[PDB]
Amino acid sequence: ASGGGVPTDEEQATGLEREVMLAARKGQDPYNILAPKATSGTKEDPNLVPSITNKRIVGCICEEDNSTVIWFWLHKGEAQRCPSCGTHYKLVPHQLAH
Amino acid sequence: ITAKPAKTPTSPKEQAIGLSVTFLSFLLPAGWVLYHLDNYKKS
Amino acid sequence: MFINRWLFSTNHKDIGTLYLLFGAWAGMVGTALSLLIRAELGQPGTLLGDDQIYNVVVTAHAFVMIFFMVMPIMIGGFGNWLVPLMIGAPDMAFPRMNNMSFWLLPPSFLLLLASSMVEAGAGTGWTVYPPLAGNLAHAGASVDLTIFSLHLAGVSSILGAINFITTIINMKPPAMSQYQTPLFVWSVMITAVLLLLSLPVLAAGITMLLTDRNLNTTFFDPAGGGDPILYQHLFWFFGHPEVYILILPGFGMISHIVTYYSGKKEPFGYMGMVWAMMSIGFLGFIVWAHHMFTVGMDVDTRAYFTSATMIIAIPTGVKVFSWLATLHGGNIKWSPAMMWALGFIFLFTVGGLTGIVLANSSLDIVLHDTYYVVAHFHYVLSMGAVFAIMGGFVHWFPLFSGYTLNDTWAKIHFAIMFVGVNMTFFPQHFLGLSGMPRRYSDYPDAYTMWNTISSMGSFISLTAVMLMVFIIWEAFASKREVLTVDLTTTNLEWLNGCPPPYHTFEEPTYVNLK
Amino acid sequence: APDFHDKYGNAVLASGATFCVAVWVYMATQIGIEWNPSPVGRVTPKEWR
Amino acid sequence: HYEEGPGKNIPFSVENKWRLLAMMTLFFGSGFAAPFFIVRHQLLKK
Amino acid sequence: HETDEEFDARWVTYFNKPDIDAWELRKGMNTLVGYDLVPEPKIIDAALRACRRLNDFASAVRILEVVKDKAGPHKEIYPYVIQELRPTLNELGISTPEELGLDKV
Amino acid sequence: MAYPMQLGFQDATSPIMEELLHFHDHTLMIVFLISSLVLYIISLMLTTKLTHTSTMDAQEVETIWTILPAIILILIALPSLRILYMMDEINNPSLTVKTMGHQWYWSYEYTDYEDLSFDSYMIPTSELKPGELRLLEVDNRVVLPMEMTIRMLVSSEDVLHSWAVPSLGLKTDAIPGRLNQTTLMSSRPGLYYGQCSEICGSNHSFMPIVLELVPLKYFEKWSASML
Amino acid sequence: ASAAKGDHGGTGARTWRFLTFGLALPSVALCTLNSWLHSGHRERPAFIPYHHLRIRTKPFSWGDGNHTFFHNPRVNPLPTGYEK
Amino acid sequence: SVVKSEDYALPSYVDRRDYPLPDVAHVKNLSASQKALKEKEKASWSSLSIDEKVELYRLKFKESFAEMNRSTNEWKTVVGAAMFFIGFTALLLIWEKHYVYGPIPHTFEEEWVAKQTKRMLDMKVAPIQGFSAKWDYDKNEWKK
Amino acid sequence: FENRVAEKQKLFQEDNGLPVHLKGGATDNILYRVTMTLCLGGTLYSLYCLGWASFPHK
Amino acid sequence: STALAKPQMRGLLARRLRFHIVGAFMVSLGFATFYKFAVAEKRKKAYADFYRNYDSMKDFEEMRKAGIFQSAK
Amino acid sequence: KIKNYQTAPFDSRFPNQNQTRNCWQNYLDFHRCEKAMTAKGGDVSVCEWYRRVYKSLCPISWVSTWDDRRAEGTFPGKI
Amino acid sequence: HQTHAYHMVNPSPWPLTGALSALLMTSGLTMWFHFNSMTLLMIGLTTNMLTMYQWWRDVIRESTFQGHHTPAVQKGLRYGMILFIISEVLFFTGFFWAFYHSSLAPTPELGGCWPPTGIHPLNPLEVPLLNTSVLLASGVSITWAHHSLMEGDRKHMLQALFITITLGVYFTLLQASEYYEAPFTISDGVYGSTFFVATGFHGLHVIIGSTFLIVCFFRQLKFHFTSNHHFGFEAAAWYWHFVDVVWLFLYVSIYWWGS
Numbered sequence A: 001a002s003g004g005g006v007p008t009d010e011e012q013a014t015g016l017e018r019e020v021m022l023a024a025r026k027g028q029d030p031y032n033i034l035a036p037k038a039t040s041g042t043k044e045d046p047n048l049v050p051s052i053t054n055k056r057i058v059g060c061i062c063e064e065d066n067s068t069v070i071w072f073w074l075h076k077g078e079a080q081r082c083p084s085c086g087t088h089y090k091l092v093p094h095q096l097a098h
Numbered sequence B: 001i002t003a004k005p006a007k008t009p010t011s012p013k014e015q016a017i018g019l020s021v022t023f024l025s026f027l028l029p030a031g032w033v034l035y036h037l038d039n040y041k042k043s
Numbered sequence C: 001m002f003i004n005r006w007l008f009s010t011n012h013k014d015i016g017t018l019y020l021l022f023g024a025w026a027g028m029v030g031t032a033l034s035l036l037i038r039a040e041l042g043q044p045g046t047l048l049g050d051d052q053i054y055n056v057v058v059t060a061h062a063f064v065m066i067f068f069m070v071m072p073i074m075i076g077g078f079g080n081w082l083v084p085l086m087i088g089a090p091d092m093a094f095p096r097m098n099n100m101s102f103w104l105l106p107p108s109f110l111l112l113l114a115s116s117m118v119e120a121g122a123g124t125g126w127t128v129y130p131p132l133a134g135n136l137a138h139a140g141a142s143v144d145l146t147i148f149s150l151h152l153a154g155v156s157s158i159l160g161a162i163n164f165i166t167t168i169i170n171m172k173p174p175a176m177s178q179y180q181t182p183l184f185v186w187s188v189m190i191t192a193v194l195l196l197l198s199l200p201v202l203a204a205g206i207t208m209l210l211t212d213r214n215l216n217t218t219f220f221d222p223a224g225g226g227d228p229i230l231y232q233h234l235f236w237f238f239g240h241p242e243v244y245i246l247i248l249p250g251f252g253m254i255s256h257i258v259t260y261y262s263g264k265k266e267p268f269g270y271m272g273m274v275w276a277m278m279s280i281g282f283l284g285f286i287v288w289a290h291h292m293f294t295v296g297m298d299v300d301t302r303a304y305f306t307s308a309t310m311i312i313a314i315p316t317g318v319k320v321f322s323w324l325a326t327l328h329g330g331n332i333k334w335s336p337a338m339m340w341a342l343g344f345i346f347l348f349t350v351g352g353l354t355g356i357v358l359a360n361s362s363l364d365i366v367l368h369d370t371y372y373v374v375a376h377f378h379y380v381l382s383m384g385a386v387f388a389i390m391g392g393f394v395h396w397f398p399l400f401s402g403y404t405l406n407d408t409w410a411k412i413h414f415a416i417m418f419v420g421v422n423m424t425f426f427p428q429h430f431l432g433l434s435g436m437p438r439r440y441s442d443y444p445d446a447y448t449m450w451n452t453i454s455s456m457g458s459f460i461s462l463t464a465v466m467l468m469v470f471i472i473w474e475a476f477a478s479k480r481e482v483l484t485v486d487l488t489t490t491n492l493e494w495l496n497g498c499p500p501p502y503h504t505f506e507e508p509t510y511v512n513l514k
Numbered sequence D: 001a002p003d004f005h006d007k008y009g010n011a012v013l014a015s016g017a018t019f020c021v022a023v024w025v026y027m028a029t030q031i032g033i034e035w036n037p038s039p040v041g042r043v044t045p046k047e048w049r
Numbered sequence E: 001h002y003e004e005g006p007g008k009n010i011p012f013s014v015e016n017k018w019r020l021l022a023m024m025t026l027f028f029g030s031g032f033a034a035p036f037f038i039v040r041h042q043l044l045k046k
Numbered sequence F: 001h002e003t004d005e006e007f008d009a010r011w012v013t014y015f016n017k018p019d020i021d022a023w024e025l026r027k028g029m030n031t032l033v034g035y036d037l038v039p040e041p042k043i044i045d046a047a048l049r050a051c052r053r054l055n056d057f058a059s060a061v062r063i064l065e066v067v068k069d070k071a072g073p074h075k076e077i078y079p080y081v082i083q084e085l086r087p088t089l090n091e092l093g094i095s096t097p098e099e100l101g102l103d104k105v
Numbered sequence G: 001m002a003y004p005m006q007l008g009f010q011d012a013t014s015p016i017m018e019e020l021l022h023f024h025d026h027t028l029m030i031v032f033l034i035s036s037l038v039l040y041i042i043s044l045m046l047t048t049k050l051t052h053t054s055t056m057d058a059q060e061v062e063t064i065w066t067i068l069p070a071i072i073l074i075l076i077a078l079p080s081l082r083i084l085y086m087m088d089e090i091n092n093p094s095l096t097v098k099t100m101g102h103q104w105y106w107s108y109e110y111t112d113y114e115d116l117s118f119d120s121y122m123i124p125t126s127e128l129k130p131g132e133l134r135l136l137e138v139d140n141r142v143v144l145p146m147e148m149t150i151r152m153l154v155s156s157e158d159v160l161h162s163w164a165v166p167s168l169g170l171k172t173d174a175i176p177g178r179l180n181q182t183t184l185m186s187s188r189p190g191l192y193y194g195q196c197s198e199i200c201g202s203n204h205s206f207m208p209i210v211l212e213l214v215p216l217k218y219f220e221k222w223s224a225s226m227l
Numbered sequence H: 001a002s003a004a005k006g007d008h009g010g011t012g013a014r015t016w017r018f019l020t021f022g023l024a025l026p027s028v029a030l031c032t033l034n035s036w037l038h039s040g041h042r043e044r045p046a047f048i049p050y051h052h053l054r055i056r057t058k059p060f061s062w063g064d065g066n067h068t069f070f071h072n073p074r075v076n077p078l079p080t081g082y083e084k
Numbered sequence I: 001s002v003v004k005s006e007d008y009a010l011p012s013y014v015d016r017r018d019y020p021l022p023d024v025a026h027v028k029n030l031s032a033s034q035k036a037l038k039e040k041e042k043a044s045w046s047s048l049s050i051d052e053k054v055e056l057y058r059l060k061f062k063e064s065f066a067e068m069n070r071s072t073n074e075w076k077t078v079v080g081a082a083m084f085f086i087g088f089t090a091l092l093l094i095w096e097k098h099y100v101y102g103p104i105p106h107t108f109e110e111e112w113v114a115k116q117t118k119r120m121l122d123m124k125v126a127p128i129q130g131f132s133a134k135w136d137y138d139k140n141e142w143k144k
Numbered sequence J: 001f002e003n004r005v006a007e008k009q010k011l012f013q014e015d016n017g018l019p020v021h022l023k024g025g026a027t028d029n030i031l032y033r034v035t036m037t038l039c040l041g042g043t044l045y046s047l048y049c050l051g052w053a054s055f056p057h058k
Numbered sequence K: 001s002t003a004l005a006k007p008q009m010r011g012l013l014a015r016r017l018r019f020h021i022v023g024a025f026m027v028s029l030g031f032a033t034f035y036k037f038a039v040a041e042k043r044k045k046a047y048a049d050f051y052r053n054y055d056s057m058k059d060f061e062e063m064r065k066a067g068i069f070q071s072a073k
Numbered sequence L: 001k002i003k004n005y006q007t008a009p010f011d012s013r014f015p016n017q018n019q020t021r022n023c024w025q026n027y028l029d030f031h032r033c034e035k036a037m038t039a040k041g042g043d044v045s046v047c048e049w050y051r052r053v054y055k056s057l058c059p060i061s062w063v064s065t066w067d068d069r070r071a072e073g074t075f076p077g078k079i
Numbered sequence M: 001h002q003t004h005a006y007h008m009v010n011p012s013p014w015p016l017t018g019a020l021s022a023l024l025m026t027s028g029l030t031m032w033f034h035f036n037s038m039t040l041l042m043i044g045l046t047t048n049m050l051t052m053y054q055w056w057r058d059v060i061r062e063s064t065f066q067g068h069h070t071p072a073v074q075k076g077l078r079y080g081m082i083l084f085i086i087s088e089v090l091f092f093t094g095f096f097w098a099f100y101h102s103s104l105a106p107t108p109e110l111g112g113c114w115p116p117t118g119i120h121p122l123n124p125l126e127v128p129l130l131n132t133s134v135l136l137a138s139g140v141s142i143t144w145a146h147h148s149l150m151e152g153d154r155k156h157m158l159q160a161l162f163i164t165i166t167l168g169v170y171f172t173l174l175q176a177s178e179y180y181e182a183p184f185t186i187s188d189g190v191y192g193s194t195f196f197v198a199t200g201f202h203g204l205h206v207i208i209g210s211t212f213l214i215v216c217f218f219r220q221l222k223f224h225f226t227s228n229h230h231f232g233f234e235a236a237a238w239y240w241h242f243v244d245v246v247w248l249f250l251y252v253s254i255y256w257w258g259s
């Protein structure tokens, strides 16, 4: 019966484990644990790709169940397009970019 | 693949040298042991 | 700096680099050993004057080429360099454990060299069967040293295998399924699984051999109710997966090279290729007694092992055809790596087909412990595994170093090597059909012509080795730095430049779900 | 502008092939290597007993 | 941080090609020589 | 999959898009030369006009070189294509690679 | 025995070995068929400037390249397994002989009737007589009657050896604590040679096997004379 | 599966502790007592110098080379018989 | 056109048969007169001279298809050098025969071989195909 | 006993450029130097033994 | 002038493949067949012929007189 | 019976290549039979077939080792 | 600077001291077996403990104190540990195979029966049965520990864990005593050989397993574990269950069936 004495993560988790824990509480994903969800990927509704620098590598699985991923660097600026399927991607500095 | 011209070009003469030295580092010590084998068999 | 970086590394690239240096050095040792074998056999008569020493040289040739050259280069070398880069992982799952896998190898190797220096060496064959390997026919420390060398090489590959499987499973972008990984990554994962299961069984068998030799156990000694055949089962239960472990990552690299120089975006039949390597891994656990067809097993067991072994041709056939299918319609670039690959495809097939001959326990009665076996396995190893190692090395060398090789020299190197390994091993078919035993330091005069020719061919491959060292010096000496690499959209490992920075994917890649 | 293989291809091809044939023919036939070829149609059998 | 870039991500220097050649030679040549000398050791041992 | 005629018409349509941008032009040629065929003159004609709308003379020439390359050892294919494009070539002022001396090494 | 520049198998001296010879021809035929087919296709893929570099559908072609090899494997395995069982098959032998491997020589025992046994050592090269074979001759041959089914029992008194005679189609490992059986039947009289086929140490290369196949009547007198 | 019981209501630690003290430890107490009531030595077997037993192909690396590590003089004969 | 090693993350120029229209122009900076040529390109292409057309092509692309697909004489060097080094290996073999191998066994003496041949024929080695089958026992000679 | 985890979290997170195996202070450094001395002294001794065993001494 | 007729323009590689793959089989089989009848049937015939007239006692007697046996002089 | 012995016949209890147990079993049976008789004033010759069979199949050193062991009271098979 | 959740490990000397310590131990064993000296071995064992101590200390620092074990890292550690146990299963398999091979086909030198002539097996209903109940009992108390930990109950976790440790120790003493009393030894043919090598490796794993539990008990005393994050505890518990199961198989095969 009764008796605690075991600390919880809320009380004792620290460093990155603590950051991931707090960020998930506010439904945020700054350490890229989850797959992001595609938009329609048109010029008007591009996939927004957060980054803390001015470029990030994108992998495009053009069609569900392709075995081949298309890799290319996405730079800050106008949306760029997967050279295979043309879906649009745009780098958003920040969210991350602290 | 494309490449920059050599920063430190290795001229044909320099190749001859690197090649000759490479071959001798392999050949001489083995050749020396093989040459003296019959010496080693029964001393 | 130097010590922190190179002795205390937690970086997958540096450690892959250390594997490559180690395996290159071991390869020279194993090459010298292979030349001492051919010198002994190159004319009738006795050259060394001591068949214990010829036995030691043959046994050490095998351990060296397998545990210290092939595995460290393919799994430790290319595996650590390319796996994290192919799935966008910032390093291996266990970066400090990774470093101990590497550091186990120099001392393991030292123990192997020690064994051939104390007493009269371990003249046992790489199979180290008792009673020959036991404490009467091989009294003293040499065989114990060999056993401990195998222990440490086993602990190394087991921890490495756990690291690879963990990394490949857990450290991919969350959107990427296993059916989106490149074939090289698959080939490593599969290999790591075969390592994980097979090496503990070897470690068990050779521990029993150790206790027979020093603790008065009688696992293998009929005077105690023990049975030398039990050793062979344990050994080969590891040994057959071991041979698949030696070729799988080779398969992996072949698929990457042939695709690349064909200018294709992916191999033909990706899912057939994954299925083939899986099927090969599975069947590789249930065929081992085809190394035991003359020990006196019952006929039904031999019928079963013959039948199960043949079946392996089917999935392997699917890979060979799928590589041809990849070439089909290609924009073929005749790079030197492409040349190694093409040579690989044809010479591996020939080595594979002589294995199908050996698979018949019927015919194996007559071919077992002959040079036909030796021809079979140097085809798939020295023109399968080695060719894949050379093709991957010339293909990825600019990515590891940031420098280019001289292509023309590299083609000269392939040409000489192609002639030397065929001249060496081709006539050994005749030797084994006509009845020449393996592990002989001299032979009946009838067998002289093929042996003389085989030994001349081994000197030609020596010249190719010497050249290769000069070719690598030339690259470093001239410093042509890489500018641009084609097809980076389907070859992620090149996308961080050459050489890539010490930390890559500090920010991981972005891949949408959809 | 003409490259290394342009200036020197023929010379390399011709001397390499020639040097290679000469030295192998010399090696195979003049230094006493014993090939032990088939005695069939070459050797006259002699009584042994 | 550590040095990065060509000639920097290896535990040996390629700053001088002649010194590089001497080192390569020692490194590959010691591996190649070793078995010939182990064979000699065994012969001389008895 | 889809018929010949349907394939040809898709590609013609693709290149006739009035506001085609340079990216789309490249993407279309680069994709098309992946197939086991030499494209129909009416596809090439549409691609040439796209070049003209994008003010890109050099790409029109490059397209012609590619047609000849894809024919590989079928030496008859290229002169036939040029014959059928002759009106467009004359109209737009497009020189062939041979006329420019670009077929020579 | 092998002869200089031989490419294939030694001529069969037993019906089992003849059977292996034809089975090997069937198989190598197939080996030639496959490797030439692969070599031709490799050439075909590399000898055209035509390209097709977009995706190709795998899922019809893989059938052919899975069924065809499975049929071919069945064509090798049917005859291979026929011979295996035949190698094992019900013999009723007329004589049993035992051979025991040692480091480094063989001893033979014929104990059906009288306790006969003897050791069989290689003739050193310096003691060969003109016309004798370097590394193959023994001082005491295994004398056996031709045209009879003989049971051979093989074991060892020390490490592993393996008793082999290629021209009879025989190889059976010799294992201490164990009796392995093989059946031997020669269609012809004469001398047939083999060599220890499991590495057994320093003199592995130098412990040959010579059988002397003669008419029963000679075998009987030879046995009496060897007691 | 199944044994003779229930439990899936009030959970966790309490059920596992119930099992630890209600079943697990009492089984240990019972097997202990059962060991106690079957202890008291067996006569040492008669010595026969069987060649498949008392193997010595190399001396042990301790003591006089002839005693196994947990040698019990009462029940473990040497190759030449019981000691003293 | 000076490609830099740190441009690796930027789209790049390739010549490949199979990727005829690469991601960037061969030349990206224009001089005064090249800017004026690009202005001309905007007018009718009938007005450009041959020189002008060629120059436009050379600003867009580095090599033409003909240039990129040209064959070379590299094969001569590679086959010739391979041969040279193979010939070189024969010198090692000569060295080995001379300074390393001692005499071969006396069973290779011509006299020994003639007698051993005879013995092999008397025991009818490989009488079916291999050896003795090629001896004509009646005429006492190798079958012609 | 007392929960002292927060203090160690603070100690081991202190930004002093030290690697984790030395962050605990003088004691880490000693244990580290003792381990390294034993391993290198040991290896040297095992080399000496190997060289020694590589010859017969009767 | 005279206009050129429209040649085949589609599926050129597949056409080359359909033709040669029949040759590939022809040559494969050819090589197999050659082995079958230049070696394999030749071997059946050599063995059949060798033992058709073979007398093991006659063979022994010859070997006996040439002095090869230890057990039979 | 069978003063006709040429060699041990096929024995379907030991149908495989490993014939170790065939030697061993016939050795036991012989000696069991010899001790079954001799004890009860009987004639050993009913055992003879077991003896001929083991003598055909067993290596001399196995036989001789096992006899030495019976003589010393260390033979491990039950007779 | 990272925006992944993985751990970049500070450069470390422990892999190299570990590797060296492997060389000293095997060198040592060889020197011991052949040249009668234990000095190298002692040295190797010493540097091996120090390496283990420091390396796993550092793991505790990286995790409990620095917070690097995010859920992605923790998930890798679960895989690693499972895979490690699998490799330990295949290791024991080889000794089970040795046992089944010897006992299903006993050779003539054995008297051609199992157990061999002259071997007097232990009664499986006696101490081996007690040992069985003892390891099974500790599988129950360690499950009690786990649930006390998950429900945040410090006291009862420490008490279930103490009990599990005590039973581990008891098994180890019962087994030592049985060893001393056994009338057959490791040198009694393949019977003593398969018995002592298979159960001796197992006993060594009971020792390693008890040690790991002791480590968890002290970490628990010091409040390292949270009610949701205590992987060293879960790993020690899988490993404890593994040791338990391998004993069951020992008991059914060697003590019971093989008696």
Ligand SMILES: CCCCCCCCCCCCCCCCCC(=O)OCC(COC(=O)CCCCCCCCCCCCCCCCC)OC(=O)CCCCCCCCCCCCCCCCC
Pocket: C350, C354, C422, C423, C426, C427, C429, C430, C433, G007, G008, G009, G028, G031, G032, G035, G036, G039, K039
């Ligand atoms: C395959 C690797 C590369 C090969 C190149 C390197 C080596 C050069 C050899 C290059 C020449 C290769 C041509 C085949 C030689 C087979 C010899 C033979 O008659 O075979 C017979 C048996 C023995 O059988 C007999 O008992 C009856 C023979 C009748 C005896 C009368 C003498 C007639 C002589 C005719 C042939 C002489 C050969 C001597 C030749 C000795 C020189 C080495 O031997 C065997 O089984 C040998 C086992 C080999 C298993 C691998 C086979 C796959 C190779 C792929 C070939 C594809 C097309 C080639 C395409 C060729 C592309 C270059």
Ligand code: HEA
Pocket: C243, C244, C246, C247, C290, C291, C309, C310, C312, C313, C314, C316, C317, C318, C320, C348, C349, C350, C351, C352, C353, C354, C355, C356, C358, C359, C360, C364, C367, C368, C369, C373, C376, C377, C380, C381, C385, G034, G038, G068, G069, G070, G072, G073
């Ligand atoms: C990487 C090394 C490697 C590989 C991949 C293999 C692959 C195979 N090996 Fe081999 N082998 C060894 C290394 C290897 N081997 C070594 C080292 C030994 C000796 C161990 C010792 O004694 O020292 C040995 C020994 C060995 C033996 C022992 C013979 C003896 O000792 O008497 C046997 C017998 O079955 C065997 C068979 C096979 C088979 C069937 C394959 C197959 O996996 C091959 C499959 C590939 C193909 C078949 C060709 C490609 C397929 C097609 C083109 C499709 C159509 C084909 C058909 C329809 C037939 N091998």
Ligand SMILES: CCCCC/C=C\C/C=C/C/C=C\C/C=C\CCCC(=O)O[C@H](COC(=O)CCCCCCCCCCCCCCCCC)COP(=O)(O)OCCN
Pocket: C151, C154, C155, C203, C207, C215, H068, H069, H070, H071, H072, H076, M172, M175, M176, M179, M180, M181, M182, M183, M184, M185, M186, M187, M196, M197, M199, M200, M201, M202, M203, M204
């Ligand atoms: C208390 C129960 C727990 C058991 C552990 C206690 C002892 C320490 C040993 C543990 C190491 C593991 C086992 C090695 C094998 C032997 C242990 C068998 C258990 C045992 O201790 O067996 C004893 C014999 O021990 C002997 O030789 C002792 C000899 C000890 C020398 C060890 C030899 C080193 C073996 C090498 C290990 C390498 C394998 C590693 C593989 C690495 C994986 C890749 C039994 O004593 P006995 O007097 O013969 O019989 C009883 C008579 N009354």
Ligand SMILES: CCCCCC/C=C/CCCCCCCCCC(=O)O[C@H](COC(=O)CCCCCCCCCCCCCCC)COP(=O)(O)OC[C@@H](O)CO
Pocket: A013, M052, M056, M057, M059, M060, M063, M064, M069, M077, M081, M207, M208, M209, M211, M212, M215, M224, M225, M226, M229, M230, M231, M232, M233, M235
């Ligand atoms: C008397 C002396 C004789 C004994 C001889 C040798 C002794 C062996 C020592 C026994 C093993 C001790 C292992 C202790 C490891 C402590 C490290 C640890 O437990 O680290 C944990 C991670 O697991 C991890 O690394 C996983 C670590 C797993 C290690 C697995 C242990 C098996 C190793 C044994 C080797 C077997 C070889 C046998 C074959 C011969 C840390 O994460 P958490 O627990 O979540 O804590 C953090 C929380 O605070 C978060 O809020």
Ligand SMILES: CCCCCCCCCCO[C@@H]1O[C@H](CO)[C@@H](O[C@H]2O[C@H](CO)[C@@H](O)[C@H](O)[C@H]2O)[C@H](O)[C@H]1O
Pocket: B027, B028, B029, B030, B031, B032, B033, B034, B035, C035, C036, C039, I092, I095, I096, I099
């Ligand atoms: C398997 C790989 C082996 C391939 C063969 C190596 C090819 C030859 C390399 C040269 O080797 C040298 O040859 C000399 C003989 O030509 C030896 O000198 C010996 O002979 C000389 C002249 O007779 C004396 O001057 C020397 O002192 C004496 O050591 C010398 O030591 C040895 O280095």
Ligand code: CUA
Pocket: G101, G102, G104, G160, G161, G162, G196, G197, G198, G199, G200, G201, G203, G204, G205, G207
């Ligand atoms: Cu006896 Cu090899």
Ligand SMILES: [Cu+2]
Pocket: C239, C240, C243, C287, C288, C290, C291
């Ligand atoms: Cu195998």
Ligand SMILES: [Mg+2]
Pocket: C368, C369, G162, G197, G198, G199
């Ligand atoms: Mg063998």
Ligand code: NA
Pocket: C040, C041, C042, C043, C044, C045, C046, C047, C441, C442, C443
């Ligand atoms: Na020799």
Ligand SMILES: [Zn+2]
Pocket: A060, A061, A062, A063, A070, A082, A083, A084, A085, A086, A087
């Ligand atoms: Zn896409």
